Amino acid sequence: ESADLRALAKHLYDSYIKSFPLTKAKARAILTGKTTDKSPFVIYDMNSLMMGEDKIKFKHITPLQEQSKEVAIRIFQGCQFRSVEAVQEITEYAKSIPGFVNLDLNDQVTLLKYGVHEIIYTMLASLMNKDGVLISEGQGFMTREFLKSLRKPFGDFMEPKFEFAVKFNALELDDSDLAIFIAVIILSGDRPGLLNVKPIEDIQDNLLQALELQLKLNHPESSQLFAKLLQKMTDLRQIVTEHVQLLQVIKKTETDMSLHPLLQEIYK
Amino acid sequence: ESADLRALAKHLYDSYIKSFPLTKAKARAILTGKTTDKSPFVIYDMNSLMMGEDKIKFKHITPLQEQSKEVAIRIFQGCQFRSVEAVQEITEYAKSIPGFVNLDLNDQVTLLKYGVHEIIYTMLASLMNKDGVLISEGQGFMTREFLKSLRKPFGDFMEPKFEFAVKFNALELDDSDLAIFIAVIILSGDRPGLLNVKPIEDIQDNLLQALELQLKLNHPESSQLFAKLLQKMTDLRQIVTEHVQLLQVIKKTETDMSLHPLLQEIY
């Protein structure tokens, strides 16, 4: 019966809300300006950056850079802390996924290990528009151009994201939809090291049906969306892959940089 | 209307047959399956390879392994020769997919250029099983072991395909299913340099609709088969991408040989 999928649809949207403070909806309301209830301070140049710390809560170094942790770093390190906070949230959302907490704990760990970032970059799409990405719970907004215009081993970090995001937001999906999609991303099974695929495959199979229907109802006039959406899961894999190697480059550049353990562990 | 799709699917099935000599069905019967009416010649040992040129018309080389060109290469350069026949077999099939031709000539070429490797490794899983892959018009059968016992680079070459294949075959798809699947791969749409996507996506949307029903009316007991088949295309995009990585190193090997250029152009 569908009614059960719809109920499952309802269940996941409900945990999504409880788990993530900045829903795509809050985010877009901030970007589309129209609803100028609260607009973001815009960081487009080093000048703005220093200013931003003033306007927004930035415990980083506002004044001089180079000799005391340059900008490129503080932004990257500032970025680090956000992923972690992202991981704690996604981890929190997984638990609410029917059947996820009853899987071999080892598996649960593997699913989060490989799922976290494809999910991080999908949610990130929600905070991005052709020209930039919201930061600090939406209080700020940092330009795509300003980001691309960063140092050699740091300016190449976001561009690929933006590209995936521009074509992804293209599908015009909303939170109710992402809720299930990230759930499907989590219960993969092609993950290296899994011990009991079938039980995992058995849940994802239920999620997908839930998605199929969700996309059908939420997007009638949108032909073949479900099919186009699953294919998007391929763009992610690449992004991650490019993300880790470019990441390795850093390890060598600045051996004085420290990768947050919760992230150091996840990577492999 | 389900009538037009059922038609489209049959149309594609009919074409796929005329274009592809060795069908899964065929290869299957032959493989680990029985149907032993003409058992295929096996190549499990460095010695079974040699003497394999006697029967099994190989249009590319004679058996000679003794300080006179290595085996790994002779085999590697064989997979190529065959893939090139493949490309042609695919080009014909591509040209029978409704709308395909009425597409910008540059778009057709682009679609073909990037979607050919994925189509191959998909069809290669037809001729494979966890123990080995069917060779030469299905006349032969080279062992997985042997391929894994090849040269250093040439070693971790086919393995990633054997693993993809095992998992792909698990889906237990038939030629009627594969036929529509191949088309969907071709008419992708997110290919670099395309000029006019709309017509492309429009035809794929249609092929995706066709595939869905196809799988519905042939694997009912199967669940979310469509979804799972679609997420297999990512494992494909990966096989091919990782295949240029193990192929880029080959350039750093056998290429600069004064006597062999007219052959380098062919590939």
Ligand SMILES: O=C(O)[C@H](Cc1ccc(-c2ccccc2)cc1)Oc1ccc(-c2ccccc2)cc1
């Ligand atoms: O983290 C974010 O919210 C954004 C988008 C983003 C970018 C990259 C990732 C990322 C995810 C996993 C590993 C590495 C990076 C995750 C999110 O990137 C930012 C970069 C800098 C800042 C920033 C924070 C404080 C002061 C100045 C800039 C904010 C966001």
